[PDB]
């Protein structure tokens, strides 16, 4: 008995869910189940054992792809959203969320600035959620307030000129769309880690870097008010410059140090972070 | 522990450490309040980062249960954090701490509601409920010198405080004995049959909570009443439950048709 069956097919996934999802004796309403942050409707149902099936392209319905060195991981979820109570003032049942994952095996140097002759001449950026010690990748589940997200940004290192990686901005939201409500800016103003400027957070970029094409940072976990699904998506804007180019107010990684009450770059001159405090790092 | 309670003669005094969660991080004094009424603190001891509340045993929305040999006053401390740098997110969770005071006690009728375990054998704790659980409530009336009686519940109303006329509120029982909660949605709410005694009335209610309420608690105020133990039930004095299976109302005792006014939503005598 598998409450949730996942078929990872060639260019689609097929999820089958039992309506006795909690085995509480009460079957859930088929329409209360949806797929991914987009809430796609089910594709079919089978009254024989009371199941509901969802089928979607690997890129549809708000799925999220991570590209690792030797695999592709597509991640999405099943939503259970109970229908409102006859009287709206009360709530008898909480919304649930079920993580869904699909794994697939993957298949004259150059510069990204001057040209891209080959289809193959393409940078692959990635964000990874790492363990406290940064040794290995860690699960997307089990987080509590008071825990810390260790995020590692990196860019592929093959057959190109040495690069230095930067994070222009990160934004958390309840879906992969960062322009949706609600949302909160972790990094902003071209590399200013503004989350570590306020309250009692210890959010910061880590120094030194492992390579110039890797940027690490720690973020204190949080959640969105009014959100009963208890999830977080984070969309970052990464960019690169040549590995020996001087950092400046447009290309930097600055953290606020509460202990010294100052901004501190991962590299570069101290005064490059000045525009972080003013909240505007846009060239005149 | 981080909460000391002094149960004194006609007042309680609660002392709370601001390092409430044992992490070293001190909460704001103003984020603590007493009872559903949210009474402000009475004093602060800065040297020990403590906050003290003092209130009469009947103030601040406390709730008294009268048992055969004891009086139990129940209240709580609320921690309601102040808004984050950006109010769309939350960095620190709310909290609620139950507070209890026991006093030995020292023909009129005494009514009581008790929260019972699923087997009805014993009374159970007011904590540990989750959405999906069931409240087993037992209404009863003391055994006086006087004649045998029959107990009825006119109405129950849940709210965020002992005042049932406050917002929000929800009617569990209404229209003089109609258990309207069991009429809608997929609830199994009903009166239990048969009764243990004629002066006892049991019912099960599917747990719920109020939208927008971050404290996650509920109070239930019922109106109980009695009639002679052998008086015919009527549309004014009854205990009716709804059954979805048969789409009908069913009294615990009495003629089936007594529950008719339940569906119409008016059981006035007029």
């Amino acid at each position: 008995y598998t409450p949730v069956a996942v078929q990872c097919q060639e260019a689609q996934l097929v999820v089958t869910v039992h309506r006795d999802l909690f085995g509480t004796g009460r079957l859930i309403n088929a329409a209360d189940l949806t797929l991914g942050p987009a809430a796609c409707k089910h594709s079919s149902l089978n009254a024989a054992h009371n199941t509901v099936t969802f089928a979607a392209g690997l890129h549809e319905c708000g799925s999220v792809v991570q590209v690792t060195p030797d695999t592709l991981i597509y991640r999405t979820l099943i939503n259970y959203d109970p229908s409102p109570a006859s009287n709206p003032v009360i709530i008898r049942t909480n919304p649930a969320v079920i993580p869904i994952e699909c794994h697939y095996p993957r298949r004259p140097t150059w510069s990204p600035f001057n040209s891209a002759l080959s289809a193959e001449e393409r940078l692959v950026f990635s964000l990874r959620l790492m363990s406290d010690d940064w040794s290995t990748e860690r699960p997307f589940t089990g987080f509590q307030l008071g825990d810390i997200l260790n995020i590692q940004a990196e860019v592929s290192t093959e057959n190109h000129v040495p690069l230095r990686l930067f994070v222009d901005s990160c934004v958390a939201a309840l879906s992969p769309d960062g322009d949706s409500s609600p949302h909160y800016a972790i990094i902003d103003f071209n590399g200013c880690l503004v989350d570590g400027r306020v309250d009692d957070t210890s959010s910061a970029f880590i120094t030194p870097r492992p390579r110039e094409d890797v940027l690490r940072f720690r973020i204190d976990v949080f959640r969105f008010a009014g959100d009963n699904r208890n999830l977080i998506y984070i969309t970052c804007h990464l960019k690169v410059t040549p590995a020996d180019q001087g950092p400046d107010p447009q290309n930097k990684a600055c953290s606020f140090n509460k202990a010294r009450n100052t901004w501190v770059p991962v590299e570069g001159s101290r005064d490059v972070c000045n525009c972080c405090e003013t909240g505007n790092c846009e060239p005149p | 522990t981080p909460v000391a309670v002094q149960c004194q003669e006609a007042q309680l005094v609660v002392t709370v450490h601001r390092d409430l969660f044992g992490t070293g991080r001190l909460i704001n004094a103003a984020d603590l309040t007493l009872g559903p009424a949210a009474c402000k603190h009475s004093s602060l001891n800065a040297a020990h980062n403590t906050v003290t509340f003092a209130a009469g045993l009947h103030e601040c929305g406390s709730v008294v249960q009268v048992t055969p040999d004891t009086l139990i006053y129940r209240t709580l401390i609320n921690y309601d954090p102040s808004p984050a740098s950006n109010p769309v997110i939350i960095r620190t969770n709310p909290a609620v701490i139950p507070i209890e005071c026991h006093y030995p006690r020292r023909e009129r009728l005494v009514f009581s509601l008790r929260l019972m375990s699923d087997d009805w054998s014993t009374e159970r704790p007011f904590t540990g409920f989750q959405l999906g659980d069931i409240l087993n409530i037992q209404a009863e009336v003391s055994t006086e010198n006087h004649v045998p009686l029959r107990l009825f519940v006119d109405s129950c109303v849940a709210a965020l405080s002992p005042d049932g006329d406050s917002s929000p509120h929800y009617a569990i029982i209404d229209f003089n004995g109609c258990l309207v909660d069991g009429r809608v949605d997929d609830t199994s709410s009903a009166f239990i049959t048969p009764r243990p005694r004629e002066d006892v009335l049991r019912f099960r209610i599917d747990v719920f909570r109020f939208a927008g309420d971050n404290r996650n608690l509920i109070y239930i105020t019922c109106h109980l009443k009695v009639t002679p133990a052998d008086q015919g039930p009527d549309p004014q004095n009854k205990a009716c439950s709804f059954n979805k299976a048969r789409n009908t109302w069913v009294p615990v005792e009495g003629s089936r048709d007594v529950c008719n006014c339940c569906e119409t939503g008016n059981c006035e005598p007029p």
Partner: peptide, 21 residues
């Protein structure tokens, strides 16, 4: 030469009163 990468979904605990010990 930039790009937008998404990380998630990150799942938190259902308990909105969760606190340290």
């Amino acid at each position: 030469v930039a790009a937008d990468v998404v990380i998630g979904p990150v799942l938190l605990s259902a308990d909105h009163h969760h606190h340290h010990h």
